[PDB]
Amino acid sequence: DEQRRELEEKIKWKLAELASKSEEERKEIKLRVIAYVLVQLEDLQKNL
Amino acid sequence: DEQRRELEEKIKWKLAELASKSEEERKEIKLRVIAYVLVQLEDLQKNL
Amino acid sequence: DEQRRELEEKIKWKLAELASKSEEERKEIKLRVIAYVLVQLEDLQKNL
Ligand code: NA
Ligand code: NA
Ligand code: NA
């Protein structure tokens, strides 16, 4: 599927961006990711 | 944007909550986050 | 709620799948998860 391939390219681009980040920057990013997913899980746990 | 600032406040609140969790609780939370994102990625990989 | 219980079962199934993965496979999966969430955060940071 087209959209599937586009998503993989978006993911690979983000991985290349992440590769340039320092160890501490990566930890800050991972923390942000965890917090965002948890906010998403809560707001979803409300309507679903 | 308003919604953007609101999201950052939601993320900061979640970060403050995470900061109070023990190391083992944090590992349990990260595991849950990983599993949830993968479920989301699959269900999305179906409609998209 | 029904959908809530279904989500927990989906998450537990994914956790069981993750448990079978090697340490290196788990790192690859976590990297993919981080990149996907960041793509999601960007595309959301555009419409919201
Ligand atoms: Na660099
Ligand atoms: Na504490
Ligand atoms: Na195994």
Numbering used by the authors:
A (entry chain A), B (entry chain A), C (entry chain A): 4 to 51
Sentences from the paper on this structure:
While kcTRP3c.1 and 3c.2 remained recalcitrant to crystallization, crystals of kcTRP3d.1, 3d.2, and 3d.3 grew readily, and their structures were solved via molecular replacement. kcTRP3d.1 and 3d.3 were phased with the original designed atomic coordinates of kcTRP3d as a molecular probe. Initial molecular replacement runs of kcTRP3d.2 also used kcTRP3d as a probe, however these failed to produce a solution. Only when kcTRP3d was truncated to a single helix-turn-helix equivalent to a single repeating domain (or motif, i.e. one-third of the trefoil) did we obtain a solution, which contained a single repeating subunit sitting on the 3-fold crystallographic axis. Since kcTRP3d.2 sits upon the 3-fold crystallographic axis, only a single repeating motif is present in the asymmetric unit (ASU). This pseudo-symmetry and averaging are likely the cause of the higher-than-average R-values expected for a structure at this resolution. The crystal structures of kcTRP3d.1–3 validated the accuracies of the designed molecular models and their intended deeply knotted topologies. Superposition of the structures to the original designed atomic coordinates of kcTRP3d produced all-atom rmsd values of 1.84 Å (kcTRP3d.1), 1.43 Å (kcTRP3d.2), and 1.90 Å (kcTRP3d.3).
Deeply knotted proteins, whose topologies may introduce substantial barriers to folding, thus represent an interesting test case for protein design. Here we report our attempts to design proteins with trefoil and pentafoil knotted topologies. We extended previously described algorithms for tandem repeat protein design in order to construct deeply knotted backbones and matching designed repeat sequences (N = 3 repeats for the trefoil and N = 5 for the pentafoil).
